[PDB]
Amino acid sequence: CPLMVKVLDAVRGSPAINVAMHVFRKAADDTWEPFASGKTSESGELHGLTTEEEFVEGIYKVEIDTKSYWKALGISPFHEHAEVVFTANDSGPRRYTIAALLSPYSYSTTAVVTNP
Amino acid sequence: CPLMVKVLDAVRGSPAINVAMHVFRKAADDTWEPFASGKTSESGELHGLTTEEEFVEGIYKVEIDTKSYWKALGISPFHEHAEVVFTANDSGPRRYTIAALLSPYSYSTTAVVTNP
Amino acid sequence: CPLMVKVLDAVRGSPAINVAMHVFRKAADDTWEPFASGKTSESGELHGLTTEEEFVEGIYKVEIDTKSYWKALGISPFHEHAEVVFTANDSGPRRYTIAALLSPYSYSTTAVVTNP
Amino acid sequence: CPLMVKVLDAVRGSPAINVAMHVFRKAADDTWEPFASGKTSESGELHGLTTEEEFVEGIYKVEIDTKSYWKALGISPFHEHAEVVFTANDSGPRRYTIAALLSPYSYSTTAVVTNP
Ligand SMILES: Cc1ccc(C(=O)c2cc(O)c(O)c([N+](=O)[O-])c2)cc1
Ligand SMILES: Cc1ccc(C(=O)c2cc(O)c(O)c([N+](=O)[O-])c2)cc1
């Protein structure tokens, strides 16, 4: 699993379950091309987005539909979504965990980048 | 000042000075149109991006160039930028403060929304 | 004002108003002695806790009563309080802004330290 | 594992390894009694702090020695440590994950509280 996304809920203190997200890769003409997508599991994690051979260097965007998550809980949110945009670097061996911590009017995101 | 952005550096414990950002508004054809731009001051704040007359209802995107900020400090950060996307003014004019807290592999954003 | 504390509500997207906090200083016998206290204003800020003469070198603790804040809003939070413990002024007088961002099951704190 | 602590490094984008922490429980006379301790593993996690039979309702404090972590990396930190103080509640079945995200001048902590 070269890329995993984990989402947490800071209001209920729980994994954020059934959060939908799309992953895009920047194309030559500076447009965003769909790459992968899915929804978080009961653990708040989304695995199996890509494979090592497909996950080449490039600029990737993870668009997390936070608004739909809060709407389903009956809570008015600020953001339309959370976008995480990053360059994937193959100068070393690197697995990526993107974690997002969600509140209605705030979110934080961090990258845990580890070498196998 | 209906829209202000404040940027902080969590490594140095300081305002994030001279951070560029661009603000976009979603047009009727679902494209992002340029709306305003500027750089943070010595206090880490960017004021005067817009006016009450110009800041109509809509979906706005603030793209904060965090990558250039860290690179100039000698750090290779994870993110290309910090994006904040939100619907503004859809129940009337509000005042928005967007705050971003920056680390090389993490950022957080929050909104303070007040009614004049 | 060498010490200011700002508290924000990440659920409502607002300053956290009327939040009590106590400041302690570590005494020579390693006990915590009361140093100052107060409540945040309508802007979520607490100014005037101390003076430059009184704010000597030492280890300080700010204990922010986040639990009472959430309880009065009908929420049972995780934390009893948000504590910030730091050495102050040990290379000369600095100005400290402690900012706390609150959610029911999460908080973040950051410091902005400036040299007068 | 009724209680697990995970620590992440927002400067290097990695688990925070070999971070020492002590867990305390509030005693009848309002003093902090040692309860458990350990250091994070290569994954940034500390498991096996307590057992279900020993982890009774009460006020617990997790004191994470963040200062020693940053000092070992040659980075000047703001906080003496990060204290997470919370009430453990047995009104339902509850496993606790305390996660801390560390920067030199900022930290965030959240609780993921799940039912087995
Ligand atoms: C921005 C942010 C801050 C804190 C968290 C966070 O609390 C968290 C919790 C987990 O159970 C967990 O497995 C991870 N992880 O692997 O990165 C992070 C998640 C995101
Ligand atoms: C995401 C996040 C978390 C904490 C901060 C933060 O530390 C901060 C500090 C200030 O002096 C201040 O005036 C504000 N503000 O008005 O929103 C925020 C900034 C951003």
HEC string of A10-31? CCCCEECCCCEEEEEEECCCCC
Q: What's the farthest any 2 CA atoms get from each other in chain A?
A: 44
Q: Does B98 touch chain A (CB under 8 A)?
A: no
Q: Which residues of chain B have a CB within 8 Å of the CB of C10?
A: 110
User: How far is the C-alpha of C5 from the C-alpha of B107, rounded, in Å?
Assistant: 21
CB-nearest partner of B105 from D13, D78, D106: D13
Q: Ligand 2 centre from D31 Cα, in Å? A: 33
Look at residues D53, D87, D79, D67 and name the one whose alpha carbon lies nearest to residue D21: D67
The kind and range of the H/E element at D37 are strand D32-39
| Structure token digits, residue D40 | 């994070």
Q: Does A13 touch chain C (CB under 8 A)?
A: yes
CB of A97 sitting under 6 A from ligand 1:
yes
What is chain D's percent helix, strand, coil content, to nearest 5? 5, 55, 40
CA A12-C101-B107 angle, to 5 degrees, is: 95
Contact present, A37 and A25 (Cβ < 8 Å): no
User: How far is the C-alpha of B34 from the C-alpha of B109, rounded, in Å?
Assistant: 21
What CATH superfamily classification does B1-116 receive?
Transthyretin/hydroxyisourate hydrolase domain (2.60.40.180)
The kind and range of the H/E element at A81 are strand A79-88
Evaluated on CA atoms B80, B98, A32, A46, the torsion sign reads positive
Which technique?
X-ray
Length of chain B, in residues: 116
CA D105 to chain centre: 18
| Structure token digits, residue D59 | 């006020």
Helices (H), B22-95: 66-72
Single-letter code of the amino acid located at C56:
V
Resolution (A): 1.6
A105–B106 C-beta distance less than 8 A: no
Q: Does A57 touch chain B (CB under 8 A)?
A: no
Single-letter code of the amino acid located at B70:
W
Residue with tokens 């994870």: B78
Q: Which residues of chain D have a CB within 8 Å of the CB of B106?
A: 10, 13, 101, 103
